[PDB]
């Protein structure tokens, strides 16, 4: 079918065979990542080559390998051994989750720390946390996982309510050694439970909510063909899914009359990092790259009808590979539906006597993932007027600690003795731009204030200025909410009827960027997060802002390296990388389970059309 | 019943009778403004005293009067004659709108200007606009309206497509004299029509949109008692309606257990200003205060079921006074409904095996108004988690001009020869705070970055700092998006279970504030718009950020005068005034009719509750 169709179970199986029948797949080999590759840059590509990229880990301790197979041709295109100390470790394997707790349970240092706290080892849950890169020389080259303990009073108890502060362990997951156990001192383990389904906590449930029924008696207005191709209200796109990025949007275009006009070639959340701002050595190394290290697509939930997605929902069940190369389906992992969006346009004109009102609607493509204590909803919206928007919804259970006696400048109190370390959830949307084709350019537009005087005697004038970003070395931009700064992506060789380059304007939320000291390890490893907007020249090997192997990578791996190429981006095939995130100082209201907090960005047509593209929407 | 109930037709008729009886409402008198006053500050009130404030205009040129009557007691509490040259003219009367075009139709200077452009006077519409305060000394003390011409080719033609640039006229609407006709030169009058209902422009209407039905089989979850008292999912409030302010929310409180806890005593949009940034003399005086000068409430549309408000809607039809004191009902002028709001909270816990998902909902209270070419929707939202939000939706037809041949730094092109001068739509939300009562304070909270070194060896630490605003002189604040600046309103005498003062945090959108030069007439008249947040000590006569009389009134009233009192606001009855707006550089997509653009703000609980207030929300 389409070269952008979702990976089939058969294709995953065929990859497994190909790797097996080559000595790449076997006994101590585990697939840490597998995903289909996007078609190469071309126009008359009438020869389909479905290729898959795989990261293969070796349990014995042997060197991992990056292999690209061709499923169409049943071949191995490349297979390279990786020097992980140089290029970074492979993505954390799901099967290594339990390992940190298991190994620590027989460690005398650990057991001693628990005994001192009178904690039963069988009730101590341990979180498999990414290690990052700090001052531990012995960790370079080794696949380390750090562990923080949470007491679980019983099977259905929420362990997050009972953090064990003053203690942290480091574990080499291949040699299976507890490399270290640090105990800075005993902290009271918070006693209150955070069991949000416990009637004693919830109280009598409300009986006041009457139903809100959302139906489509004639079915939805969008069509799904070729498994993942969507056609909706002039919009056209292909919904892809990657185990690392999650939902990826391909070929977003708009049928402007006779033309199917491209806007965005590929849209994805290429990275997601959660840096913590607690200077306690128990947590100061804590930075979770949910997308890069853990792979958010891998953990997508199976969304239930009527609970997660309301109304007329069309589901996609993406297929992924397990650690052995067998295909695993994520049933109902992606929701697709259209929802009413209030008033689109309205005017009651006195002079003409015409009263006009039209309703708005948006196509929604979403999924929800669970990464330990956090749960994130990723939502992509396409609007009738041409607006494209992304929204991330952060919920789950807050990552806890003990609340220090005498307070804290970096931790807030949730319950008696229970603290919540300050942190941020920072995202990177990778937008492979295609405004009316690939010849694009980006301009930074600032509102311009004018001084009262000659030519502006009443001092009421205000303007705007646009600065073209010509080389990558000038394409690392910061927000300026004060001057209403935005960035416009245009095609200098495609003019609208008023002879102006067609374009789309990116409206950012202007939330704070990475707060960590610039010389910090996280500042270097997640350099993308220190600036709001980056523009690079497209390159098939530049996929993530943090690089291909984020786990225990030293620093400067992605964007800072690409940007260093200083390529021409003025009227070229370019990619926009927008950093946006939430800064959290958890409140009592976030405990025991946090209500959704949101962040995102949007792009609106800016002289893309010759007039409003919604004049043909009826009153119905 | 409740002293916060909406004005009834009988009450308005009684005010008329009381005024007539007092000799204050003879045949030459007109009611420019009539509204019910809120109950006085207190507790033990001795029965009801429904009072109404009225601004009385005199068509014969006599001085207007401000009068307060007690409709309950049949008395005039006060009546004072106004010196308009000093304190400001009364709001524009609806009847004076038609006067501008009518008077100009027989003016020879006007006729000559039209003849020079070959325009038929019977086809030239004149947009009657507020005058402002400029260098025209003869205007001081007179009621002036300025006029800009638009050609209307036929009865149902949209005149905005055909602006007549280079011409403007000033008219005294009382003495009925054209004071000035300015013609700076002819400009081609744009020829394309902007008729969005013309099949020739719309093209064939889409047949692709299938229905989205939203119903509530068991009715809505909120209850309406006493005409305007709403109770929904723990929230309690009274929906009032004022002709100047539009929808006003009273006594917003949350039922936390046995306690009905107040949050906001009164919330309204106390002012709106639309300044233009085109330095052409034809439009450089252009600034309307839709709320203050025109009274947005009197122009509220009657909303259509299914079109304007989709779902199970409960309408309020507010009653206002006509120019003579007779009651007039705005049928279905306010929509009240609850809408589904996606996911509220979600977590799939590995350790406990418990998968939890809850849906969100919001109570919506809204109205839409039309003032000339603009249509604005005002939306207030109450969420399950305790969040309060306001959203303004700006639509209608763009205010046009000619597009200068050699381009423009202050006007954009929409169609051939058609321009759209740059402008802003700035709002002022007046929040009379009552966080767990009237003893409140405001703190400005900035995220704090920390330097790597002693105490922060890994350079990951980040904090927050809060500065209490103690006196009015230090309560005029600006946004700082870069440092995640927010403002927290707390009650220093009411502490949550963790012994922290309860509070609510205001999250602003950090959009650009007033762009006009600080020395401009508009910067002084709309002084409130130059700053993001102001905090004043409550006073019953400090109602609007611009004063009681905005029309043709210079600086001297409003917030700048209030603030000078430098009152104590640290743990006192205080009022928060938040400026938030849209900066518009119209684009081709905004022509022929503008798709909705939005702006707003929200307040989220900040340690107000002892834990999440939505744990009792059913699975459903
Ligand atoms: Ni968080
Ligand atoms: Ni506008």
From Swiss-Prot, chains A, B:
NCBIfam families linked to this entry: PRK11504.1
Protein's organism: Arthrobacter globiformis
Complex formation: Homodimer.
EC code: 1.4.3.21
Protein name, UniProt field: Phenylethylamine oxidase
Lineage: superkingdom: Bacteria
Cofactor dependency: Cu cation; L-topaquinone
Gene Ontology biological-process entries: amine metabolic process
Modification after translation (UniProt): Topaquinone (TPQ) is generated by copper-dependent autoxidation of a specific tyrosyl residue.
Disulphide bridges: 309-335
Taxonomic classification: Bacteria, Bacillati, Actinomycetota, Actinomycetes, Micrococcales
Residues bearing the modification 2',4',5'-topaquinone: 374
Conditions for induction: By phenethylamine.
